[PDB]
């Protein structure tokens, strides 16, 4: 069963050259039409262009001047060039059978010229430490970080009920997410809420008691 | 000149057990050169027809398309809990391939209106002369929603940052985040901080506020 | 099967292939003529262990798998045998995707000698489709 797998830098810098390579198992990449597509946010899709079984390639209009495509026989594996990049070639990119039959996971490639950046955590309380209903949401704003991912967790994970953790949007560069966790008024602040956050890129976890 | 296809309705929600079409139009006539696709969250896109109505061995017979030329229909007899998520069309009639907009299948459930809470800024950032402030809409029903920011009664705008769930797999209802981010002397300039929601489920807008001219 | 001219014009048609890719009806009507005078079920063996299929004869080294061709790549990922079927859909899925690659037509010899640079609209030329 032909099976395909994307691999290669998820971080690329503005005017750099993205490079992705798509391993081809259970089959020949003579075998087939491959191509290479890519979703941007939004749910827009664009079909980047294909290299056939010769090796011959067709390249979106859009394209044509910075894309090539080209593949390794001996290797079963074609890849994916894009120079001059910009933050407008982030994005989800796939390679694919030409029939659309077979498909990789997929691999995130973003463009960005920051750097490694830890995330402050602040805690979110309601206003005068106030409490109304049967019920209090508390949170947390894991502000500035990059690059993504981080691991945001309630009481070491102890807290896991009526919680909602947003996905992370980018501002000014940096990546910004909030979480919300809801407890009975009877809960806080009689027992004590905290919000885990780690961030494998900078080799941080912070806990943030609310 | 690319063909351009444009799918409707962008978004459709419904009832596990019942039946929908989805519409894909080209611009130009493709004869039967348009492909369907879905694609869940978090998974690749699966094709579901090919050539407009051929059918894919090992594809669920819910699903099956009809159309020619311009005029494409994708239609699943009674959707299942599995079938939501994003379907795309394709054509392959010339290069370059274009997808379309893409329809959103959703579940349809009962309306429910959000739980709303706003946060001013925490001590910690105001000290690294930051100010967030957040306001969280909870578990709604339908996914319109609009959030509108005032300050000392002005509506704002800049500065506001918004983040929204997919449809929650635990109740399908919708959350969503909304930010005002200000420096922590815009931010003591003021006093009102207002995250007001209009939604489906009630004429007046829910209101959350605080002042800073108090706790 | 063997099909009436304008009786395949209208199925090709069917089918998609007019202006697909940039090949007008004609030029896969004509193809058709010359490559087996629109007969599905015709078919040609070759010096080496491969065969051509169909309508449009599609070689079993390259396109199609007979299960008894040395070197067989089967491009269409399809038993040949689909490609001799009274009905075309398999036949053109093929063509579709031969002709996709840098190519085109190019790839059917007699295309090119009796159709290629000619006036194949000829070809649907009087047909009611």
Redesign the interface.
């Known amino acids: 069963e032909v099976q395909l797998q994307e691999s290669g830098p998820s971080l690329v810098k503005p005017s750099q050259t993205l490079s992705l390579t798509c391993s081809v198992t259970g089959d020949s990449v003579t075998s087939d039409l491959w191509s290479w597509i890519r979703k941007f946010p939004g749910n827009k899709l664009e079909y980047m262009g294909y290299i056939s079984y010769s090796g011959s390639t067709y390249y979106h209009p859009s394209l044509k001047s910075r894309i090539s495509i080209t593949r390794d026989t001996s290797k079963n594996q074609y890849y994916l060039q894009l120079n001059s990049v910009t933050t407008e070639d982030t994005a989800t990119y796939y390679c694919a059978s030409w029939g659309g039959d077979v498909w990789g996971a997929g691999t995130t490639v973003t463009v960005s010229s920051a750097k490694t950046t830890a995330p402050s955590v602040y805690p979110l309380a309601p206003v005068c430490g106030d409490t109304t209903g049967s019920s209090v949401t508390l949170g947390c704003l894991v502000k500035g970080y990059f690059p993504e991912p981080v691991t945001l967790t309630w009481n070491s994970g102890s807290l896991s009920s009526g919680v909602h953790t947003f996905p992370a949007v980018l501002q000014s560069d940096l990546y910004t997410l909030s979480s919300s966790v809801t407890v009975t008024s009877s809960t806080w602040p009689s027992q004590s809420i905290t919000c885990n956050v780690a961030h494998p890129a900078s080799s941080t976890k912070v806990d943030k008691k609310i | 000149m690319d063909i351009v296809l444009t799918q409707s309705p962008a978004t459709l929600s419904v009832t596990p057990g019942d039946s929908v079409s989805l519409s894909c139009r080209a611009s130009q006539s493709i004869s039967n050169n348009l492909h369907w696709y879905q694609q869940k969250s978090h998974e690749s896109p699966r094709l579901l027809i090919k050539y407009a109505s051929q059918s894919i061995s090992g594809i669920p017979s819910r699903f099956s398309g009809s159309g020619s030329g311009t005029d494409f229909t994708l239609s699943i007899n009674s959707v299942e809990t599995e079938d939501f998520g994003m379907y795309f069309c394709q054509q392959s009639n010339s290069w370059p391939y274009t997808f379309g907009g893409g329809t959103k299948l959703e579940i349809k459930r009962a309306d429910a209106a959000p739980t709303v809470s706003i946060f001013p800024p925490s001590s910690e950032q105001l000290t690294s002369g930051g100010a967030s402030v957040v306001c969280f809409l909870n578990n709604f029903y339908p996914k319109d929603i609009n959030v509108k920011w005032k300050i000392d009664g002005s509506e704002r705008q800049n500065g506001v940052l918004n983040s929204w769930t997919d449809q929650d797999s635990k109740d399908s209802t919708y959350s969503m985040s909304s930010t005002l981010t200000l420096t922590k002397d815009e931010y003591e300039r003021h006093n009102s901080y207002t995250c007001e929601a209009t939604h489906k489920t009630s004429t007046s807008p829910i209101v959350k506020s605080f002042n800073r001219n108090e706790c | 099967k063997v099909f009436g001219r304008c009786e395949l014009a209208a199925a090709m ?10 090949y007008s009806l004609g030029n896969w009507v004509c193809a058709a003529k010359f490559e087996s005078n629109f007969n599905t079920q015709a078919t040609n063996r070759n010096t080496d262990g491969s065969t051509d299929y169909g309508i449009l004869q599609i070689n079993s080294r ?1 396109w199609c798998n007979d299960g008894r061709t040395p070197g067989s ?3 269409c ?1 399809i038993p040949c045998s689909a490609l001799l079927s009274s009905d075309i ?1 398999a036949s053109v ?1 093929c063509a ?2 031969i002709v ?4 085109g037509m190019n790839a059917w010899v007699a295309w090119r000698n009796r159709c290629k640079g000619t006036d194949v609209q000829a070809w649907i030329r009087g047909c009611r489709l």
Do not use: I, Q, V
């Not at chain 3, 996709?100 to 190519?103: C, K, L, P, Q, T």
């Open positions: 048609k069917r089918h998609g292939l007019d202006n697909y890719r940039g390259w790549r089967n491009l990922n859909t899925n579709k995707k996709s690659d840098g190519n």
